[PDB]
Amino acid sequence: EELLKVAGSPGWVRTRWALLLLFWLGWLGMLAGAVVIIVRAPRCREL
Amino acid sequence: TLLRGVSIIIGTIIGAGIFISPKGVLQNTGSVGMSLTIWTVCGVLSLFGALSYAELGTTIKKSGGHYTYILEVFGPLPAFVRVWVELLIIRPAATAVISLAFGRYILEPFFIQCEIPELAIKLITAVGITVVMVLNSMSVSWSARIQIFLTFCKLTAILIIIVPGVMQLIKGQTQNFKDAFSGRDSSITRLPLAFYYGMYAYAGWFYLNFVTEEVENPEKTIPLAICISMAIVTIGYVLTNVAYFTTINAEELLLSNAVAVTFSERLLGNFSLAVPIFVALSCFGSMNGGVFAVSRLFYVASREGHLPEILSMIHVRKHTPLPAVIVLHPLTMIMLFSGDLDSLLNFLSFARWLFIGLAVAGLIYLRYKCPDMHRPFKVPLFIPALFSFTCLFMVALSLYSDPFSTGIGFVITLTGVPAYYLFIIWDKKPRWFRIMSEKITRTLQIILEVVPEED
Ligand SMILES: N[C@@H](CCC(=O)O)C(=O)O
């Protein structure tokens, strides 16, 4: 509770920013990979 | 009265498993009538097990859920192995299976009459997992205000298959029921796989803590409510399956996937507006609940000291089970990217049903030794014994079937026995441990912004 005083310190939040930014970049990149797989996939010859 | 409890049980045991099981059930059964018999017997066994767990919950009265039952009757080691397998096999594989189904159903509208290029299934599945896990780690209030909507969609999804099935049945286009119990051989070896597929529709009977204080009149409310709930859910599931069989032939189901969208195509007109989206949302609902349950699991495991206390840890403010999602997400990624729905289901089912049967088998031992615990409800002798014997015997027979898939689960559940050295050891000699763990545990606690609940 009161023992996480070092979390509210400069640099530590920088590590959190970096980790979350890398996670979000990976998520957007893999979603874009899914999108390009779908788009470049064949378009279902019409019946 | 008891209506609210019945509603809770109904909403906790429906799940998305009814949209995954029928394909596998038919695949390893090869006969419509035998498949329906499999559904009925799985429902009966689920009712028996639910009664057994009701008796267990009433006879112990100690919080903890699945942990307490196994720990109390057997000892520390089976409980440790149970948590080990639940963390390493059961939860990640079940989540991966549900997520693969959700991804296939959400990609079906875009691929109307085609094949989804496998890899896109995994990517959309993983994206859904990531968004669900961050939503669970975002807030708990908004993760519950949406749970009611997901449950309502779950109720809506079953009607979309039930009512048109009723219309087809009343009009009597049932030409596949002329010889219900004949077809492909599908020798007895595949019966454990059929059985495994059978339960997963009834996923949610376990967990579901029933403390003997919420009910009005206990020891009659819990058994009656659970019996009616299993009865009506089994009736709904068998009606859903026969509705599926009204339009979808056995061959048209065997050489196909995502049976719901095939049913919609073969029966309804405009379909992508209703069936795929509703079933994808139904599969989305099961995603939210599991994270909270597995996070809760760690809370009781910290008292005995079987897992590091950081796993039952919580955020300072914006209270979410953050540390329990970062240890479960990568495992789910591993299973979904290195597993198949046919194999992951067996991988999870072998361990989960071995341990559930072992837990229920403790009822025979508990009732034979020291029969004085003020048992509120006395489940008869034959129910827990039959459930445990059938589960253990057929799980053991499942080793012969697809051995390369359950072998990993077996060696992991045997890995827990050596893994007890993390709990007993002479001197850890912190040159290669303890001190490194102290840096690691502190680093994770600082990075993830976690403080204990009230300890
Ligand atoms: N409840 C999940 C299974 C995972 C779990 O046991 O929490 C389901 O309906 O498939």
Coordinates of C-alpha atoms in Angstrom, one line a residue, chain B residues 10 39 41 54 91 95 134 161 163 166 193 201 217 237 242 268 271 278 316 324 349 371 390 395 415 423 455:
Chain B
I10 CA -28.0 -21.3 -16.3
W39 CA -25.0 -35.8 -25.4
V41 CA -25.0 -39.4 -21.1
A54 CA -22.8 -29.3 -4.2
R91 CA -6.9 -22.4 -18.3
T95 CA -9.0 -19.9 -23.4
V134 CA -6.5 -5.4 -21.4
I161 CA -30.6 -22.0 -33.4
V163 CA -36.5 -21.6 -33.0
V166 CA -38.4 -26.0 -34.3
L193 CA -12.6 -37.9 -27.4
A201 CA -20.7 -27.7 -23.9
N217 CA -33.4 -22.6 2.9
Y237 CA -28.7 -28.8 -25.7
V242 CA -31.4 -32.3 -33.2
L268 CA -31.9 -18.6 -43.2
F271 CA -27.4 -14.5 -42.2
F278 CA -24.2 -13.2 -32.3
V316 CA -2.9 0.2 -6.1
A324 CA -2.5 -12.6 -13.0
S349 CA -9.7 -32.1 -21.1
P371 CA -18.6 -39.9 8.6
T390 CA -16.4 -43.4 -15.4
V395 CA -9.6 -40.5 -19.1
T415 CA 6.1 -32.9 -13.5
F423 CA 8.1 -26.0 -1.7
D455 CA -3.0 -7.9 4.2

